[PDB]
Amino acid sequence: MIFVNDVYKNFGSLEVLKGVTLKVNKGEVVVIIGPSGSGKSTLLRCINLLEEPTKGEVFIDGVKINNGKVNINKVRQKVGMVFQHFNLFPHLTAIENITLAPVKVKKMNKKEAEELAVDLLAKVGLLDKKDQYPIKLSGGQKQRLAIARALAMQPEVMLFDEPTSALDPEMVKEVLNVMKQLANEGMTMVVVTHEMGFAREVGDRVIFMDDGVIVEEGTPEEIFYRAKNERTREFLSKIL
């Protein structure tokens, strides 16, 4: 399903990923953590090719997507992405935000799309906001909206790029709860996060990255209670 294969990423002289490999299969919740400059967000963004590897390859569902020989829009149809600074379409209302891609991409019909949308707004607790514009929403409401929007394309895996780190503290829980609900329903997830409670409560794997490389991985409990590597322990000591 997801196979990032020994990729490297440079931004000029800035080496961000220096040989990284990640495999994730259906139903896993994988959580990637580390300090700034670990490269975790660039890895996450290679998976749906918002970033292109300098070297190495990424396969989704077993076919290579960074060889120019693939319809990348259909690849991205399958691989959802939720952004740190929520990337809502300002000129579109909540429900419009949700129905734009199903109608334009899947050629879904307006009525059916609207039913999908009202079901999703209901699911993430935004039903009362369907005809509101982004400006009028709180951070938590925005991220929940964006998650509804990604869900309306019914992806097979969902990517989360620090979805709560631009939120006010009193705003974090409500977003993490929607994420956890997704985990409980079997959604495949790769989550880049600072919130270690989430990784504990619902992650199947925790990946620890540092200086553009994976230095240790294991179950949440192995990493948070029995990390074997020096650097993992050091990082966790500053952060926990």
Partner: protein, 215 residues
Amino acid sequence: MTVDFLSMVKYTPLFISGLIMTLKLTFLAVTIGVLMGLFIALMKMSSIKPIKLVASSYIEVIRGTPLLVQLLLIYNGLMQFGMNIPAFTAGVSALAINSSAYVAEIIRAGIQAVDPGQNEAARSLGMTHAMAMRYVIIPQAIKNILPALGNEFIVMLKESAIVSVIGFADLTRQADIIQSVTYRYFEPYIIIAAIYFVMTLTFSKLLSLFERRLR
């Protein structure tokens, strides 16, 4: 002598007539400049490498070079080819051609001004470049471009005074017309500057009451 503005009242229909010509000159030049400018922007976006070169070179030249020289190059430079184009068509062509390049840059910059996250989100939902542009990016670039277009107009109003030198009966030319019968240059120039100024203020505050009705 000494100053005498009160003599100038008699020449009110001249000032007014000139004012209407500077409007007609500008409004028409910028209108064409916008249409042309769009087309050249689109042209620069094209994947066909020689065409992007053409649009780029065009913009680079028109902007890196004086409006005056472009005017005279049209009006005077074309004479020796048996082509005697009127002062008005020359001024409109020069101004619209200048405006086309500046508008071409305004558009590109209004597109570059919408947050790249919009595009990323758009594509991440499976949308193609075309759909992202159509339904997400361009509607947003528009709100960036309109107040810059409105300001391009205001700037060209001042710029259009240059067709005076070509003998077009704009607002500025009216000082050469009035003085021929009055021997006074100062007072009609002051009056003309006051008219340009009031136009600038009026259209500027009118512009601000539109930069507040979009965002």
